Amino acid sequence: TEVDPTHFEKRFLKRIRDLGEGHFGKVELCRYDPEGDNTGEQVAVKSLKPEGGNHIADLKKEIEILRNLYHENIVKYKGICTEGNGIKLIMEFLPSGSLKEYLPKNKNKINLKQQLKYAVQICKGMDYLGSRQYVHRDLAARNVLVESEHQVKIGDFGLTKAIETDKEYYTVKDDRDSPVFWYAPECLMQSKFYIASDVWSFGVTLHELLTYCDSDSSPMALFLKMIGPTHGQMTVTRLVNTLKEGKRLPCPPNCPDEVYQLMRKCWEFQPSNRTSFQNLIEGFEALL
Template sequence: MARKEFDHKVNKEMGTQEEEYSAPGTDKNDNRKEEKTSDNKKKKDEKEPRTAFAKKGDKMKPMSPNPLVTPKGTPRDSNRPKCEATKNEPSVKGKKNNSDHEPVKDRSQLSSFGSANPKTTAKDFQWLEESINKLPCFHGFIGREDLNSLLKNVGDFLIRTSVQANKQEVEKRKKNQQDVKVLVNLSREKCAKKEAKEAKMAGVGDVGRREFVISVYCRDKENPKPGKPVYTPIRNLVIKRDNGQIHVEPLKNFKTMTDFFAYYLKNTGVCKETDFQLLNPINLSTWEFVHEDIDLQPKKLGEGAFGEVRVGKMKVKTTKKTVEVAVKMLRNSDVVTREQVSELLHEARVMRMMDHKNVLRSYGIAVVKEPLYLMTELCACGALREYLRENQDTVTLADKLAFVLGAARGVEYLHSQKTIHRDLAVRNIFLTEDKTPKVSDFGLAKVTDRYEMKEQCKIPVRYLAPETLENFIFTPKTDVFSFGCVIWEIYENGHQPHDGKNAQTIRGLTKKNQFLKLTSSAPAELRKLVSEKVFTADPENRCSMTTVVQSVEKIEKPPAGAMK
């Protein structure tokens, strides 16, 4: 949308709004009212001793706004909303401390922070929510990692919702960093259910605080100095509203959103020693949708710890075709946490990069409001694990070999895109109506050739390669080992590896090089490949996924109808 159309939209939706915070006009009775108030105050002061602080619940008369004065003791670096470079979202927290006042030292310090008031009230936030949700450049819960693909020129900007980590998430992260060597014997789904139950029992009702943020593409004033961190040109400005005034810089307050955008169209602001200007509002991309674009169907495909998967219909923006999709929804918790939002967005981000017959396709996300949606292609036959278990009397050996080959091609493609899946299992492979296998679930995927765990991660031990168990290292070769477990599961009709054994036992077996063995119903060539080139202790002796694909392609197809 052109800037003129954007301005028209802002004016139409909220340009004429007058709020209850607007200063009342003076009238002839003002002085009389003031005298009565003064008399009442004198009588009250005779009865009650004066104190430096108001009682809890008392309404204090607001002080005259002095932009050069700030409460002493207010933590500048933690309690005020910050405008920061595109890195990890900071957790904006601090302690209130009523004390004397001291002047702010310089203007650059002011430009780096939001309001001196550390929190926007619920009433102000609701006003912001109602106003911002109407804007075509509001992108909802998208993360900082998505900004580089959306903001490309100086002056490009969008508005998004930032979710701060709650207390439970902060404590959990600290614990995970300490317990990096703790491994689990549960699937990620079961771990998520366990954590949700523990949080509920602990009575943790705290949710991460929401903030509205303007992300804008800027040009740095100075060249980066040696030794200083290199930031992207994108800055993030927290929108605040207190006492009816909107601002991202403490010295510049506006009564309406119209005034706010009009000012920054013609004038520059300062954030982190960088000038910014709001020139070009960026609308939703081809992979971003509003909830009204998705026609949810009653049919439920599955349910997990934090959400469910439903059938839906939507029109693809690029082709204008209406397609049936699987809609993954985060809706089982009252309000989604920062961790849940990050994982869904990460999965969607990885899926957008992929385009292969044997990799589950993403159609986009709808995250302007809750519940958050991730739309993927619909696989009519569901997860391969359930399909194998429910149809073990009818699935032929030819079918199983086709499942192995299709899934192997999908993983080979991921590795060609410099991506490690890290959670390969038949539960994460889906089948289309024509039984084409599709590798899915990229919540743990990493776009790299090598990844070292820095904190505890909920990956079941039964699928891990020896070097991962020993050194917490993930590479394409660790995916190859995990894929050997996938092959084993396919020929065992969906049964999980090392069923009934605990994590310590499985780890001990792996250390002794006592790996899984394929059933005799698997082709001899495949059994040899897995035992000699897949299940190896030394990753240097392990083959690549390309070798797996090429080897399976050479295996003669079993006779039609052969079951064992």
């Protein structure tokens, strides 16, 4: 019987270091080394922490979603490592990290033209996801991985949900660890997620890209300056209230008004009023 190239044996999967931690999950840099001499390929490995059953089903749904996504700007699925009753998502490793790590260290190499090129590639991966009736729900610069200085990829689908054929949105129940400072008003207010909700999260991701992911100008850092940083449980309702008053993230420094106006179109209060990923692409390619 033939060997499956998507089947990764646990014995040959050697953990190097953690890359990130999330919603009851974690991503590690592992070396798949069947020959045991350290020549095997580096891979990014997503697994669940030992300490919920429903979290396993979510991961299995995430694996199945990524397995069937094929786009230049979507991180490549490599395989799975099964236990079964336990599973690991095996993906390609992108040594440049996400925009959060790469942009502060490479500002000199990355001018506005290259930022608008990344914005285009983020919209292209996002539009492909949207065309397959999926809502990403976690579009942030920490999830935009750097392939090269000319290429970015949407690198994590941990919150990705299918929209039903008859529906315009998906209703979420597991709300706890929501990236609220990236979320559209309908997401914060009603737990409803539209493709237009990802367009809102794209506007925030774009803002981060234009600010080269500087920690001090981050969407959380700026929103907490607007609303206040000592509200605790009341932060989300104070965030809903400022967005209702028309307050939006300011213009990144050195970002021309034309780029800012495309970003502002991602931030129309009503989801139906927001620009689409295809229109953003036209606007970015017109500026290039």
